[PDB]
């Protein structure tokens, strides 16, 4: 798969900070509404980090108005303008599927400060 790596090495997004699959961060998403492009902030905890180089995707989950919203972005997309890590969490596994049923303090007692 080294030829795929040489193809997609030019389009990797190398300015993004490194983040673990168990911390909270905010995503600056560029959305086109017509004509002005507002940048909405999506703060929430990372749930997934599924690898594959250019096919790498990450999932961010937040609770908005009592309904949980899961949103998945590819890592190297140009739609994301900037990624800032709010705080680092201490987790025991790379997939956080358990906390999408643990409202609300039961997720807070698991996402402790690192």
């Amino acid at each position: 798969q080294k030829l795929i790596e040489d193809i997609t090495k030019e389009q990797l997004r190398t300015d993004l900070p490194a983040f673990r699959p168990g911390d909270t961060l905010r995503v600056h998403v560029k959305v086109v509404e017509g004509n002005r492009e507002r940048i909405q902030i999506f703060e929430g905890v990372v749930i997934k980090r599924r690898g594959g180089g250019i096919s790498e995707t990450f999932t961010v989950r937040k609770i908005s108005y009592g309904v949980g919203v899961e949103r998945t972005f590819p890592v190297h997309t140009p739609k994301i303008a900037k990624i800032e890590v709010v705080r680092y969490g201490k987790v025991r596994r790379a997939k956080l599927y358990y906390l999408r049923e643990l409202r609300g303090k039961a997720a807070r007692i698991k996402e402790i400060r690192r």
Partner: protein, 207 residues
């Protein structure tokens, strides 16, 4: 028309000029050497022969070595005809490369599909499945062969057998990017066949 034939490597994803994400199939398809030109006054039709992926002299026969002696090239693994190209526009031994395709064009992609082995009627023909409960002993079976009156099964009754290994053509795919340095074609969409198998990319029937 124009066309070229080669080996596909695998699939990847490429975003291009926007935020949109495109599934991309990677094909090594260069260089191709013109081996034989078919003429109407001798062969009865107009076509050209393209050779790809030259091999060692140990794996080639003496007729294979003599057939490529006219084109001044090594013997090649894959030989296929293209019909009908714009006659003549190519001489015998001229290298066909990936520069003939621009990265906005619409092409036809054909190849031998992946083998599935001897499979049942549910997977091979998409037939619906019998009930698993309410006393039923019937599931995963092809069905009734037909009526009683002909005293025979009609030809074309769909039955379990070998799936795959046949030539499949996918129409109207789009070239995402062309790589002249590394001999690569980036094609939007899915391409039939397994990895490192022979893929022929020809220009689509427009319009």
């Amino acid at each position: 028309t124009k066309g070229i034939l080669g080996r596909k490597i695998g699939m990847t994803q490429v975003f291009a000029e926007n935020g949109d994400l495109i599934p991309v199939t990677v094909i090594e398809a260069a260089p191709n050497v013109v081996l034989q030109k078919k003429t109407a006054e001798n062969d009865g039709y107009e076509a050209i022969q393209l050779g790809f992926d030259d091999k060692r002299e140990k794996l080639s026969n003496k007729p294979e070595k003599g057939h490529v002696a006219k084109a001044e090239t090594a013997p090649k693994r894959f030989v296929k005809e293209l019909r009908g190209v714009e006659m003549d526009a190519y001489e015998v031994g001229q290298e066909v490369k990936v520069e003939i395709f621009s990265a906005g064009e619409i092409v036809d992609v054909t190849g031998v599909s992946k083998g599935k082995g001897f499979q049942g009627a549910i997977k091979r023909h998409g037939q619906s499945r019998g009930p698993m409960s309410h006393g039923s002993r019937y599931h995963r079976r092809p069905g009734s062969m037909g009526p009683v009156d002909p005293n025979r099964v009609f030809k074309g009754k769909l039955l379990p057998g070998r799936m795959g290994g046949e030539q499949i053509t996918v129409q109207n795919l789009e070239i995402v990017k062309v790589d002249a340095e590394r001999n690569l074609l980036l094609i939007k969409g899915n391409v039939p066949g397994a990895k490192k198998s022979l893929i022929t990319v020809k220009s689509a029937v427009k319009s």
